[PDB]
């Protein structure tokens, strides 16, 4: 009935939020590399490699999630639905994890640049959201494990629904984290030249 269709629908929404967030992240990454060049602030080469590596990965994940979304929608238009819905939660969780590493690298970038050019309020906010997301990601990992285990051998439906709440909270918290790093970049640029 409408329970599973409603879950596939919300997963479409969540993948859209992740695409949008990725777009903003891209902007922030670009802005930092640009400021890095102008400010001149080997340890940055390896950061640039991690940025690029995790950015490829996020692009893969987004793509694979798009493919899985389509199949899931086909399965509704037409067991394998449950399986795919659970696989679609693992894809979204992975994307959130890779985006979180990316965010953390951008935060690092901002800290390096601000130690060349208050921020204590900013720091406190960064840590609060970082700790929260770390904990939401961890709860999502445990629920994913539980849901995968059940799917091999309901409890399943409950944890599937609970996993939708987990992912949504993590994204909403990432949104806040993004706004803070945007704030940080704007605050740094406003001080050069």
């Amino acid at each position, epitope marked *: 009935m409408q329970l599973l269709s409603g879950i596939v629908q919300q997963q479409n929404n969540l993948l859209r939020a992740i695409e949008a967030q990725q777009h*903003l992240l*891209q*902007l922030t990454v*670009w802005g930092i590399k*640009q400021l890095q*060049a102008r400010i001149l602030a080997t340890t940055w080469m390896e950061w640039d490699r991690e940025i690029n590596n995790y950015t*490829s990965l996020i*692009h893969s994940l987004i793509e694979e999630s798009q493919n899985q979304q389509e199949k899931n929608e086909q399965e509704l238009l037409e067991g394998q639905l449950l399986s795919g819905i659970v696989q679609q939660q693992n894809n979204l969780l992975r994307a959130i994890e890779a985006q979180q590493h990316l965010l953390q690298l951008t935060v690092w970038g901002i800290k390096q640049l601000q130690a060349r050019i208050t921020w204590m309020e900013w720091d406190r906010e960064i840590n609060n959201y970082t700790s929260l997301i770390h904990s939401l990601i961890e709860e999502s990992q445990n629920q994913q494990e539980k849901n995968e285990q059940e799917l091999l051998e309901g409890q399943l439906l409950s944890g599937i629904v609970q996993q939708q709440n987990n992912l949504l909270r993590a994204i909403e918290a990432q949104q806040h984290l993004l706004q803070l790093t945007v704030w940080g970049i704007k605050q740094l*640029q406003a001080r050069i030249l």
Partner: antibody
Amino acid sequence: QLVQSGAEVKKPGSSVKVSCKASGGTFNSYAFSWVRQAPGQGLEWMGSIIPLFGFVVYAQKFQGRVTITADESTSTAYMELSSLRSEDTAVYYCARYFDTYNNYGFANWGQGTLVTVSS
Amino acid sequence: IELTQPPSVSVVPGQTARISCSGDNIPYEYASWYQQKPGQAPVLVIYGDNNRPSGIPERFSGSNSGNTATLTISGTQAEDEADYYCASWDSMTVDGVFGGGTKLTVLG
């Protein structure tokens, strides 16, 4: 989407400010470059601005002689080139990249503005 | 960092045209391609490495081995006659660069 101000005819030594109006999208989510093309010649990257941050970055070739700004309330990107000389005669395009999260290419281009530098 | 393309390529109409663009390290998804006709703005034909934007004919394709971006046009048509450019960014300082361009001639 991207409409530029019209052809300019300039004396050597003077300045030109070329504008580019963007419509249809959210201005803060844009990435802009300026690109010039001398007649019969190739395309040449001049600089970038991400309006959300509002700071411009330049190819060293044009460092110190080009200023790139953006205005949120008019949805306009600008390119000023100073101390003009004859080899600056070219068509100048504003272009937009980061169309989507993975589009590093320039998805939209304005029509170009002809700048003619002559005595 | 320099992108280098052949000054010119010539194709029999219906055959496949290939335009290469060599660089040091074109990172994956950084190569884009542009069509330009006399008197007109450039037009994005490939981005990422193999992505066609909406409205771009299926006969356009791209690839990137890291050292060479290639534009391919299978079944080249009259209207495919134009100049083509590749673009990319420097990995570290994010400057844009274009290839020198390639004049593609459709024979007939």
